[PDB]
Amino acid sequence: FVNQHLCSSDLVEALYLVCGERGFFYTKPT
Amino acid sequence: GIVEQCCTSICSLYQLENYCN
Protein backbone atom coordinates (compact mmCIF):
# COMPACT_ATOMS: atom_id res chain seq x y z
CA PHE A 1 0.00 0.00 0.00
CA VAL A 2 1.09 3.66 -0.14
CA ASN A 3 1.06 6.45 2.47
CA GLN A 4 0.32 10.02 1.30
CA HIS A 5 -2.40 12.70 1.30
CA LEU A 6 -5.75 10.94 0.83
CA CYS A 7 -8.03 13.95 0.24
CA SER A 8 -8.30 13.19 -3.49
CA SER A 9 -9.07 10.31 -5.86
CA ASP A 10 -7.46 8.12 -3.18
CA LEU A 11 -9.85 8.84 -0.29
CA VAL A 12 -12.87 8.22 -2.52
CA GLU A 13 -10.89 5.21 -3.76
CA ALA A 14 -10.35 3.81 -0.27
CA LEU A 15 -14.03 3.89 0.65
CA TYR A 16 -14.73 2.78 -2.93
CA LEU A 17 -13.20 -0.47 -1.66
CA VAL A 18 -14.56 -0.90 1.87
CA CYS A 19 -17.75 1.08 1.12
CA GLY A 20 -17.87 0.63 -2.68
CA GLU A 21 -21.53 -0.44 -2.66
CA ARG A 22 -22.49 1.08 0.71
CA GLY A 23 -22.18 4.54 -0.87
CA PHE A 24 -19.96 6.37 1.64
CA PHE A 25 -20.85 9.99 2.50
CA TYR A 26 -17.50 11.38 1.34
CA THR A 27 -19.19 14.62 0.23
CA LYS A 28 -17.80 18.11 0.95
CA PRO A 29 -16.44 18.50 4.50
CA THR A 30 -19.02 21.17 5.40
CA GLY B 1 -16.85 15.36 9.09
CA ILE B 2 -15.00 12.08 9.52
CA VAL B 3 -12.53 12.00 6.62
CA GLU B 4 -11.21 15.24 8.19
CA GLN B 5 -8.20 13.06 9.11
CA CYS B 6 -7.71 10.72 6.13
CA CYS B 7 -8.39 13.71 3.88
CA THR B 8 -6.07 16.04 5.82
CA SER B 9 -3.81 13.10 6.74
CA ILE B 10 -3.58 9.31 6.34
CA CYS B 11 -5.53 6.58 8.17
CA SER B 12 -6.02 2.82 7.72
CA LEU B 13 -8.57 1.08 5.47
CA TYR B 14 -9.78 -0.41 8.77
CA GLN B 15 -10.75 2.97 10.24
CA LEU B 16 -12.46 4.20 7.04
CA GLU B 17 -14.47 0.95 7.08
CA ASN B 18 -16.67 2.80 9.59
CA TYR B 19 -17.35 5.60 7.08
CA CYS B 20 -19.97 3.32 5.48
CA ASN B 21 -23.48 4.80 5.76
Q: Which residues of chain B neighbour A5 with C-beta distances below 8 Å? A: 9-10
- Residues A17, B18: contact at Cβ < 8 Å? no
Domain residues for the domain of A24 are 1-30
Q: Which of A3, A18, A25 lies at the smallest CB-CB distance from B17?
A: A18
Instruction: Please name the method used to determine this structure.
Output: NMR
C-alpha A18: how far from its chain's center? 9
Q: How big is the A-B interface in CB pairs under 8 Å? A: 51
Using DSSP, state whether B15 is helix, strand or coil: helix
Q: How far is B3 from chain A (nearest CA, A)?
A: 7
Distance CA A30, CA A3 (A): 25
Q: For B3, which of A4, A11, A22 is closest by C-beta distance?
A: A11
Provide φ and ψ at A17, rounded to 5°: -90, -70
- The DSSP string of A1-30 is ---S--TTHHHHHHHHHHTTTTT-------
Number of domains in chain A: 1
Please check whether residue A4 is in contact with residue B7, taking contact to mean a CB–CB distance below 8 angstroms: no
Compute the residue count for chain B: 21
Query: What is the rounded CA–CA span in Å between residue A30 and residue A18?
Result: 23
Residues 6+ away with beta carbon under 8 Å from A1: B13
